Amino acid sequence: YEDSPTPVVAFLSVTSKVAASASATRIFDIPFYFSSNEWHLLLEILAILSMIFGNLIAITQTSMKRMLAYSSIGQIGYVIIGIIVGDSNGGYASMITYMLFYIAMNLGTFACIILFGLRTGTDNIRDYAGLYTKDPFLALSLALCLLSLGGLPPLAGFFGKLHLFWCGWQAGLYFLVSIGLLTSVLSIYYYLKIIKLLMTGRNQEITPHMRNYRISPLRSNNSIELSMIVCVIASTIPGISMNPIIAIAQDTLFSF
Amino acid sequence: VRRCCCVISGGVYENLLFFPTIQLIKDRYPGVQVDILTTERGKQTYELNKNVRWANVYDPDDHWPEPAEYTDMIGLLKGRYYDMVLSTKLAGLGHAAFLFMTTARDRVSYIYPNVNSAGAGLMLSETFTAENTNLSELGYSMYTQMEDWLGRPFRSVPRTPLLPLRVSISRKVKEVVAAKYRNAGAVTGKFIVIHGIESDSKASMQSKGDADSLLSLEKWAKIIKGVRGFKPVFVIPHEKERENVEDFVGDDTSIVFITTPGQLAALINDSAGVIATNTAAIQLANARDKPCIGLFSSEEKGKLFVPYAEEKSNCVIIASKTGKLADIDIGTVKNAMQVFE
Amino acid sequence: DFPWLTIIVVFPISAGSLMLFLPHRGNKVNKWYTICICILELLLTTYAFCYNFKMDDPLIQLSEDYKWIDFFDFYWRMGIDGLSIGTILLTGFITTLATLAAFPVTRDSRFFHFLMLAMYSGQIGSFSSRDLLLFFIMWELELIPVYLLLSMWGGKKRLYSATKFILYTAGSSIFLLIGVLGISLYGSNEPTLNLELLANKSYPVTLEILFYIGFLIAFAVKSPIIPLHTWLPDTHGEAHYSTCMLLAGILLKMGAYGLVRINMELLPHAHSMFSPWLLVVGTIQIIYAASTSPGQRNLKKRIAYSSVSHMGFIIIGISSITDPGLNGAILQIISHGFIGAALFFLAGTSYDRIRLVYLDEMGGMAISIPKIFTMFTILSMASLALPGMSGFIAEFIVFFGIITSQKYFLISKIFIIFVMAIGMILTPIYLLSMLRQMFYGYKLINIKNFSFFDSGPRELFLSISILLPIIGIGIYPDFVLSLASDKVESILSNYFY
Amino acid sequence: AVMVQQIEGMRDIITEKHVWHLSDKAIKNVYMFYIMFTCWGCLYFGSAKDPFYDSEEYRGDGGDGTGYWVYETVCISPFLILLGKKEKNLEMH
Amino acid sequence: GLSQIEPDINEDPIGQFETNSIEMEDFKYGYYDGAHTYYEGEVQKGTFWGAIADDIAAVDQTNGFQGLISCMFLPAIALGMYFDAPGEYLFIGAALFTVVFCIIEMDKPDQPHNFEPQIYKLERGARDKLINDYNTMSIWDFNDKYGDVW
Amino acid sequence: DNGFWIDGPLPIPPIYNNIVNEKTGTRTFIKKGVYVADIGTKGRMYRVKKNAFDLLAMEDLIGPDTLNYVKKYLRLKSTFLFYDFDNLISAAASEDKQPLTDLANRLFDNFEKLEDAAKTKNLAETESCYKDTKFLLQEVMTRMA
Incomplete structure (x- = not known):
């Protein structure tokens, strides 16, 4: 994901993970329920690991697409909590709405990383320092998307994680939920480490790739920004406007 | 590399002799925002580099810092996003983890000879085992391993020196030190600094490897009475010595209070002569081609701290x-009369 | 009847969100816009507290319930107790004076005052919510804005303190979430979240102790309990005065108020098990945080530890199963809100005038800044539990709740009172050490060439405005007791049988 | 109100015991008046000539209103003089 | 303060606890502490009204109307009791006073101490936000020194 | 019962076999937790007089928009009077015991009526009950003195 171009990084990360979650529900609940004890442990192990190491790696990463990949690993580790719980003791609605919010709040982040790279050129994280002065809207969008991914205030990813941990507690997965919360804090750290840079600025901690940003030398008001602000709205309000999404995700009881 | 830290230590002297290394770094790569995580008394020297950016204060030779300060500086070096470190803190494990916790592509450091560097190679790109455990005792160079790694022949020549120790003074420090020596009995052209006085202070810029580096005052009184006066201005490290110096060499002698090495170099640049003992004043005199004599306690330390004496003439x-x-105090006067005029 | 508490809580955010771009590129327009909004919100709060809040009824007033998320049974429950209205008025007063003290800020003042209004909404949301998960929402909603007005405004190592604070508070808010999850799910049949429906449940002791651990680890950092208190001396001591006077003024009191809501009247039979040890913890906390404060060369960390020390009396009054103990805890919440707010305000202005931090330097500055000197002295006297100030009656009613306690016996009461009242010997030591170090003296290099500016009329009004309730509550304590005491009986009726 | 109390040791006591209270409404009213006074002062003294944070002492050097402006300034002005020194060495001192 | 040069480190960290004051050996009593100063004869008149109104005029940004309402506000709330008991009228009037004060505090003068620290370079009088609505001057980027002298 | 900090129910102080209660329940002005000091029979006999004098001199406190504090002071000093009468009756001479407990019953029924009048913010009934309860307060004051 460091070498591949950022837009297909976004597309393949999010799309492969949602399709592979569809498969990881399908080929596990329908044909492998008889061994569902043993299976669960496997996923649980992976889930715990995918919640820890991912959210423990991206702390110390200087890239941006790479640490976004590790944060995506952590988010899918949260998703496996909803995979592990069956359809009865907290269904797959939590997993569904978290994949919804994951799309909505990761494609926005990748859209901001795209605009920072079609205007500056690079994807190293130290170049993000000083974006609040050049572009308050792009900085605000990336900060709101990352805060949705971390989930301090009532945003999309916070309430998605809340639904996941609700289903996990109710089903009785305490070691999944507690580790997921620890690593949610651990992810909040590096998200705010990003938000440190694109809010601060000192006229030399910025780079010569941030100094020459050039929003206006552009084709027009793109449709990139349209999907970016759509993803920002869909990472902000669906945390608030969650009851329709839960109600349309609860009526999927036929996965067996 | 694009951003380069430096976790150096020692004080005034050891931070001064690192200027060739930093100029080497900025000569190796085109643009390097250099930073220094040094001790207090070391940041002051970093007025005289014109090649550095931040120069924070850490005292890495504390070994037992406040965890608040330790974690603050770890996160600071992380959030500055360096590509090289170049410690010369002279420690292996423990400090190697402190350099590894910084997101650095090329962790470079010095290493204890003893067992204390049990696992430093697991975290560092370069080893640099050292001598004497008191690296300033090695002398003026002190960085030949760090230099002969920096800009090794990969495409072009090393060029490890660039007219060694090009220190540089600002105009404000020049003005305030000019007002200092003009408040003294000195003129900007014809005066001579001293910077050797018996004291108990870290502002005399001595070393970490030299103990008998600072000469007494009665022996200095005999030295300065043996020479006709070219108005020698005395450079005390603390005001308590002033009333001592006036008690020894006389009330008529003019004394200038300098503790900042930047102010000291601003004094050197205006001076026309230096009679320093083994302090940073000798190297600040060899910088900007000023005439020194450079007393020492031995020819060994003299060759170690001044190897290039045959190059400035x-x-x-x-x-x-x-x-x-316990020097002669006779022939030093003769070649002082020779060189100062 | 009318959505009162909702237009209390959402109004600062819904009025600061009108600063989308707002092309006025000086601090004047947004400074006055947001102080006007804060005054309007304070007046709305008072008109709810005066003409639409019965002070005798120890039940939920101005109640309001919506349906936000049906799966969690997550409502928009709002409600006012006798032990929560005082903290709400304190939130209004202290945050209003905080944005007054932030008048000279001009760096990114639009963002600063917006985040101030975000804190202003979130704190009242945490104090006014009768839903557990909503209490968690408004707990974590005063986490990002405080981070952003702590890391980009105030303090040398502000980034370290800000990340320490946000990760410590999040690592405790997850324990709070464990608690609300436990109570809601494993609480009873028909799982709910409404605290009004929840305060009369069984909660057997093997589960009640677990919920109490899960909530005490959450509230042990916000009201700092000395195993878990290290976030404060870095956070307060490296923050701006306008943020720090609500970090200690009202943000420290959630956790003390929380130990009353979700621990004292929701888990009473487990609080009867845990309060004997919280008592020893608070008694050790006073001495510990009064002995660390002379250890601090810094001026602002001294007052941060002072807050850790004065929270010990609230811990003790909470762990005192008495009406006097808890009334003294609520009164000390409000009293130390005023005191710590004004003290951090004056320390910040003293740093701005003097530009020195440590008490080894910064000798005699009384002749330089005499107005700051006298206001700091009066508020150190109020921190001292001096009569005529609210601190005395607080730190005496808590003692009286100890000595009139039915839980504890004399062999323990003697030790507890002794270790509590050593605190009021050690508190003179550090407070008057601060005063004699930073104000009493003469520095020969500061004769006339500096001639610093004195406390301007704004800062003088700040300090005086926070002083007058302290004096008024020292001379007549029932400005604070009378709004809580009835409710306190509604707590203690759950304890005696 | 008046009570005579006999005591063996010293004397008689003529206790009076005016049990009173400010009352529920007057307490609300003093809360009201003090909040209104806080409004008045927050507006008026906010519109006062704050003499410290207006001059070239605070607003001149840095003066953003933060607490790190001193430290970042004295960390930047070393960098600015170092940059000016490199510019001076760029044109032969 | 400024400290263009790096300051001198003090070799005597006087103490963690004792204050930074001079000793009694060097303390000139009376003159320093003011115990023997204030010889009456250098004092001035202004008996308590020629120095209160002088101090009010010393610190004031209030014009004729804003200021008159400030002087008549607290007397209006003080007579909200002991003369009548209106109720919500007091709070509605207080909110009206706050909002009209804030609208008035969008002052025609802008007083450059209000602006950012980066603005203080020189010549800032030629900058006129006071009259120029929709200023349109991209100087708040704060990453390069543009010449705004036009 | 581990010496320091008895735990669990936090029991009320008991009622020692007296008819001082209501017989339709125990009593309603009882404050749950108050530290009544176990002084001694003369001390209880004087503290009855002092609390009755307080309740007697509570005349000024009564008025419009003040009944909450009336109820609070009532239930407080009446709880003190309750436990003091309990210890006095339980340590009586068995010949002045019956008139004293009938006195306490006809005093506490009136305190109950007064609390019912003040908790409900009934001012006129509060005062009309305060009349005969003042008669009873002067009666107990001249009994104990």
Whole structure:
């Protein structure tokens, strides 16, 4: 994901993970329920690991697409909590709405990383320092998307994680939920480490790739920004406007 | 590399002799925002580099810092996003983890000879095992391993020196030190600094490896009475010595209070002569081609701290025959009369 | 009847969100816009507290319930107790004076005052919510804005303190979430979240102790309990005065108020098990945080530890199963809100005038800044539990709740009172050490060439405005007791049988 | 109100015991008046000539209103003089 | 303060606890502490009204109307009791006073101490936000020194 | 019962076999937790007089928009009077015991009526009950003195 171009990084990360979650529900609940004890442990192990190491790696990463990949690993580790719980003791609605919010709040982040790279050129994280002065809207969008991914205030990813941990507690997965919360804090750290840079600025901690940003030398008001602000709205309000999404995700009881 | 830290230590002297290394770094790569995580008394020297950016204060030779300060500086070096470190803190494990916790592509450091560097290679790109455990005792160079790694022949020549120790003074420090020596009985052209006085202070810029580096005052009184006065201005490290100096050499002698090495270099640049003992004043005199004599306690320390005396043709190095800094005080006067006019 | 508490809580955010771009590129327009909004919100709060809040009824007033998320049974429950209205008025007063003290800020003042209004909404949301998960929402909603007005405004190592604070508070808010999850799910049949429906449940002791651990680890950092208190001396001591006077003024009191809501009247039979040890913890906390404060060369960390020390009396009054103990805890919440707010305000202005931090330097500055000197002295006297100030009656009613306690016996009461009242010997030591170090003296290099500016009329009004309730509550304590005491009986009726 | 109390040791006591209270409404009213006074002062003294944070002492050097402006300034002005020194060495001192 | 040069480190960290004051050996009593100063004869008149109104005029940004309402506000709330008991009228009037004060505090003068620290370079009088609505001057980027002298 | 900090129910102080209660329940002005000091029979006999004098001199406190504090002071000093009468009756001479407990019953029924009048913010009934309860307060004051 460091070498591949950022837009297909976004597309393949999010799309492969949602399709592979569809498969990881399908080929596990329908044909492998008889061994569902043993299976669960496997996923649980992976889930715990995918919640820890991912959210423990991206702390110390200087890239941006790479640490976004590790944060995506952590988010899918949260998703496996909803995979592990069956359809009865907290269904797959939590997993569904978290994949919804994951799309909505990761494609926005990748859209901001795209605009920072079609205007500056690079994807190293130290170049993000000083974006609040050049572009308050792009900085605000990336900060709101990352805060949705971390989930301090009532945003999309916070309430998605809340639904996941609700289903996990109710089903009785305490070691999944507690580790997921620890690593949610651990992810909040590096998200705010990003938000440190694109809010601060000192006229030399910025780079010569941030100094020459050039929003206006552009084709027009793109449709990139349209999907970016759509993803920002869909990472902000669906945390608030969650009851329709839960109600349309609860009526999927036929996965067996 | 694009951003380069430096976790150096020692104080005034050891931070001064790192300027060739930093100029080497900025000569190797086109643009390097250099930073220094050094001790207090070391940041002051970093007025005189014109090649550095931040120069924070850490005292890495504390070994037992406040965890608040330790974690603050770890996160600071992380959030500055360096590509090289170049410690010369002279420690292996423990400090190697402190360099590894910084997101650095090329962790470079010095290493204890003893067992204390049990696992430093697991975290560092370069080893640099050292000598004497007191690296300033090695002398002026002190960085030949760090230099002969920096800009090794990969495409072009190393060029490890660039006219060694090009220190540089600002105009504000020049103005305030000019007002200082003009408040003294000195003129900007014809005066001579001293910077050797018996004291108990870290502002004399001595070393970490030299103990008998600072000469007494009665022996300095005999030295300065043996020479006709070219108005020698005295450079005390603390005001308590002023009333001592006036008690020894006389009330008529003019004393200037300088503790900042930047102010000291601003004094050197205006001076026309230097009679320093083994302090940073010798190297600040060899910088900007000023005539020194450079007393020492031994020819060994004199060769170690001044190896290039045959290249400036003015710093006629002086030592003591026996140890304990008991020099002749006779021929030093003769070649002082020779070189200062 | 009318959505009162909702237009209390959402109004600062819904009025600061009108600063989308707002092309006025000086601090004047947004400074006055947001102080006007804060005054309007304070007046709305008072008109709810005066003409639409019965002070005798120890039940939920101005109640309001919506349906936000049906799966969690997550409502928009709002409600006012007798032990929560005082903290709400304190939130209004202290945050209003905080944005007054932030008048000279001009760096990114639009963002600063917006985040101030975000804190202003979130704190009242945490104090006014009768839903557990909503209490968690408004707990974590005063986490990002405080981070952003702590890391980009105030303090040398502000980034370290800000990340320490946000990760410590999040690592405790997850324990709070464990608690609300436990109570809601494993609480009873028909799982709910409404605290009004929840305060009369069984909660057997093997589960009640677990919920109490899960909530005490959450509230042990916000009201700092000395195993878990290290976030404060870095956070307060490296923050701006306008943020720090609500970090200690009202943000420290959630956790003390929380130990009353979700621990004292929701888990009473487990609080009867845990309060004997919280008592020893608070008694050790007073001495510990009064002995660390002379250890601090810094001026602002001294007052941060002072807050850790004065929270010990609230811990003790909470762990005192008495009406006097808890009334003294609520009164000390409000009293130390005023005191710590004004003290951090004056320390910040003293740093701005003097530009020195440590008490080894910064000798005699009384002749330089005499107005700051006298206001700091009066508020150190109020921190001292001096009569005529609210601190005395607080730190005496808590003692009286100890000595009139039915839980504890004399062999323990003697030790507890002794270790509590050593605190009021050690508190003179550090407070008057601060005063004699930073104000009493003469520095020969500061004769006339400096001639610093004195406390301007704005800062003087700040300090005086926070002083007058302290004096008024020292001379007549029932400005604070009378709004809580009835409710306190509604707590203690759950304890005696 | 008046009570005579006999005591063996010293004397008689003529206790009076005016049990009173400010009352529920007057307490609300003093809360009201003090909040209104806080409004008045927050507006008026906010519109006062704050003499410290207006001059070239605070607003001149840095003066953003933060607490790190001193430290970042004295960390930047070293960098600015170092940059000016490199510019001076760029044109032969 | 400024400290263009790096300051001198003090070799005597006087103490963690004792204050930074001079000793009694060097303390000139009376003159320093003011115990023997204030010889009456250098004092001035202004008996308590020629120095209160002088101090009010010393610190004031209030014009004729804003200021008159400030002087008549607290007397209006003080007579909200002991003369009548209106109720919500007091709070509605207080909110009206706050909002009209804030609208008035969008002052025609802008007083450059209000602006950012980066603005203080020189010549800032030629900058006129006071009259120029929709200023349109991209100087708040704060990453390069543009010449705004036009 | 581990010496320091008895735990669990936090029991009320008991009622020692007296008819001082209501017989339709125990009593309603009882404050749950108050530290009544176990002084001694003369001390209880004087503290009855002092609390009755307080309740007697509570005349000024009564008025419009003040009944909450009336109820609070009532239930407080009446709880003190309750436990003091309990210890006095339980340590009586068995010949002045019956008139004293009938006195306490006809005093506490009136305190109950007064609390019912003040908790409900009934001012006129509060005062009309305060009349005969003042008669009873002067009666107990001249009994104990």
